Amino acid sequence: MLWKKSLSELRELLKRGEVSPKEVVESFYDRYNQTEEKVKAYITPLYGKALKQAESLKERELPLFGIPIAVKDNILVEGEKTTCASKILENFVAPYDATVIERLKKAGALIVGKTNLDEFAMGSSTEYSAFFPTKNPWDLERVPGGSSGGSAASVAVLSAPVSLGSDTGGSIRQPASFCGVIGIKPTYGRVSRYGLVAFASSLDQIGVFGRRTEDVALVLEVISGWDEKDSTSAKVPVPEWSEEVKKEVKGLKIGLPKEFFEYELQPQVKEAFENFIKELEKEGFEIKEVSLPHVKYSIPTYYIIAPSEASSNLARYDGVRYGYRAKEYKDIFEMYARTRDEGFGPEVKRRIMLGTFALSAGYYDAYYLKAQKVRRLITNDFLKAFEEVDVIASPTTPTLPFKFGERLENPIEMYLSDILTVPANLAGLPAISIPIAWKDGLPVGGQLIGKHWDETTLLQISYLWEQKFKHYEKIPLT
Amino acid sequence: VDREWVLKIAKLARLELKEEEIEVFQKQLSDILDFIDQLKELDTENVEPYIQEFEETPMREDEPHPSLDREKALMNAPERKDGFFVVPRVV
Amino acid sequence: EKYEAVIGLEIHVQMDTKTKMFCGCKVEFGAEPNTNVCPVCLGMPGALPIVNKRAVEYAIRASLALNCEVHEESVFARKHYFYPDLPKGYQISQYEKPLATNGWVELNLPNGEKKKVRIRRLHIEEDAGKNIHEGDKTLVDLNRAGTPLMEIVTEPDIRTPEEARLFLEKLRNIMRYAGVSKADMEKGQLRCDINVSIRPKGSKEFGTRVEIKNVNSFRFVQKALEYEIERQINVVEEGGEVVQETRTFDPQTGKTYPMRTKEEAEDYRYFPDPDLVPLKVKKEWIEEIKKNMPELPDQRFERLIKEYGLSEYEAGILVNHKEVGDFFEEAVRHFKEPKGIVNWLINDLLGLLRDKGISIEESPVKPEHLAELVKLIKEKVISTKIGKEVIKEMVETGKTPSQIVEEKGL
Ligand SMILES: Nc1ncnc2c1ncn2[C@@H]1O[C@H](COP(=O)(O)OP(=O)(O)O)[C@@H](O)[C@H]1O
Ligand SMILES: [Mg+2]
Ligand SMILES: [Zn+2]
Structure with a gap:
């Protein structure tokens, strides 16, 4: 049905003129119109604009020639609103393109819309979007995850085939898990953060959602690589991932962290994960218990580091150069303090307060500096475990997709969604969430954490898993 | 608290x-x-705070890059005047 | 006098780079508001800083010229505060782990004695923009935001308003000789905040500190200090305690004033900018900058005294205004009569250019012309009396000495 087709199916059709870019966009546009009222994946749909851009698109040999792509609304797309799902940035028109958007555009991709998120990418459910909640296409009483809720969701309903999100502490993987889709956050430094509205600079990474491992491997290859506009982007050559996913490496090893046994899992998740591992064992993977003596400290560490960097990075939203400004004020001080109280959502305001505390002199040593040290302890656990094993596996999430309002009561209950996801951001490691089962009607994600720069292996295992378990065929909303 | x-x-x-x-x-x-x-x-006495690995500090040549068009630089501004960002007076 | 002044200075020096500290926008004076500006230097969402290599190179050179220990690893830190001229809500500078530390400047005092003022630190940081007030509004130009600065902090080693000025003059001259900054207060290239306390003579304890901000010339720092020292001595001997505050200086009145606003400073919430890796400075690069260091004023001073046999009065003039020494040496090259050339340069040309209000870089009399004129005086082609008549018209016209000798008869 066209929107039902993968990028391989679409590429062959586009290369031989059997279809045009415009038709592709039209197809997904329809599926968008079918789904959007229920799902609410987008803040700013740009199918209209992509239609027009498609007419002038002609060179077919471009790696992403006719491909529609949704983009999270904390990644700048020039000339269109980048809201970060915030009141403080509604009506902010992006004056420049994120480096990844430049690279996709150059590769023929067609940006089809700006995707909903937790405000400033802080949250695990998308409920903190200042505008409206995005809903899980497999059960609209359920959350799609966060913060990249809309990017996961739209890939799930196939209102777009492939999608960009960002991952500070699980913001691609978790949503991938919840929406029954593939989602990867590459090694810290693999993809530029130029044009990515910064949350936690030392933790943020753009990543990719898709339904087929090749789709994800190609979009990632396109957007990855050194950027001169980003000091933290690595000068490391990008592997030819599209040619590499399909290969098979013999005698790989999987680590099951002993410390993860102590983690409260829903029985359905536990069952699905055990089966994922048994089935991988059958295919010849060696399965080993590993130790990460410090992982349990990941959450506390993250919820000191992330808020801290966030209070710093959000200092700039001030009513002076752009965005929202309060209407009533007697002073510059009031202008500042009113603009911000009114423009920022509650979770954001919470991490700002916590952050400016953790950086305050007198508390910096016991808070942020301490956390950055424990962070090295946690990274070192991984480097040592990677001496014995090739990837580390766990569930992506301790639970099945939860209900709206369920984790808004105590802010902390929201944080606990991240317990299996944050360790990879702390260690700067790549990590993928792939769908491993459907339990009580709901997707379950399996997570693989790889060594620095080893997205190849993560992707390879993802390709092998999909051949056994064809999750790309499970399409929600008919 | x-x-x-x-x-x-x-x-x-x-x-x-x-x-x-x-x-x-x-x-x-x-x-x-x-x-x-x-x-x-x-x-954590005797633990170094986490930094990402790097061989040399990334630096950039002292050569001008085209600036942003002033119109685009100001377009989003709550209030602008004569090429300037405008805010309530400060003491 | 019973008391003693203890003075420390905090100097921000603008680096003569083409480009800003953390983006590729031009550093230039008097552009149209918000034209040399950037997603980066504008503190736009998503925009990342990239360190300027020449800014780094210049800051190392300046550190060495100030006799500092240059630290092979230093860290950019975020310094947070909210102000309309500071786009990101923070200033990127250095904190703990600055570039350079433990340096010194030598002052030559009138009485002939030489004194040292220690440099506590030199660190790299970016500038903020500039505000203009107009009615009930402030107008913000961010052209200057992100311009590279060296923050130079003195130990409280200065004892006298005159010493404070002399320090500032030497610092300027070292910066100029090293070629790192033009360092003229007039153009905002050098800022200076003054800190001052008093102390019973020969005491080792430190008195309560007053900070005087936005003093705009080397002369004004002397005047501000002159008064403030008097002010504090009055207070103390009247039985009062001197109170710790920031004050302002009015050039028109020559007085220092407390501030109407009891606004205390706020925690800067310092931490390493996570957009940047540590500044790692190879020993090999320090060595290379050390080996290729331009000549510095104290060195030049002894060299001229030797190479040309000038007096300490003469060489001092030539070294304190570098372009005068440069002129002299290019002239002495055309005609190897050093004694004759300094005479005619100092006693004649300099005063004639001053009167016309013209700098030595732009004088109609080129080093060739002075060397030529001094040739005619030495070789007895013309007399001193005639020589003084032709130099006046040389300045007036721009014609060679030989040109006007012919045009008017030998
Ligand atoms: N009692 C004092 N009298 C004069 N100058 C002082 C005194 N204490 C500090 N200073 C000067 O103030 C500047 C910085 O002061 P300091 O308190 O050391 O750092 P800061 O206040 O910037 O954190 C230095 O130039 C130093 O010499
Ligand atoms: Mg400073
Ligand atoms: Zn700039």
């Missing part, structure tokens, strides 16, 4: 909290501060 504390931190952060928020953020922040207080247990 005090009302005094909440107000002092919000001042630093330039948040003019509404009276509803001051009370909620008292409990929520207290809870979060108890929640994240796990790290004292660990010994």
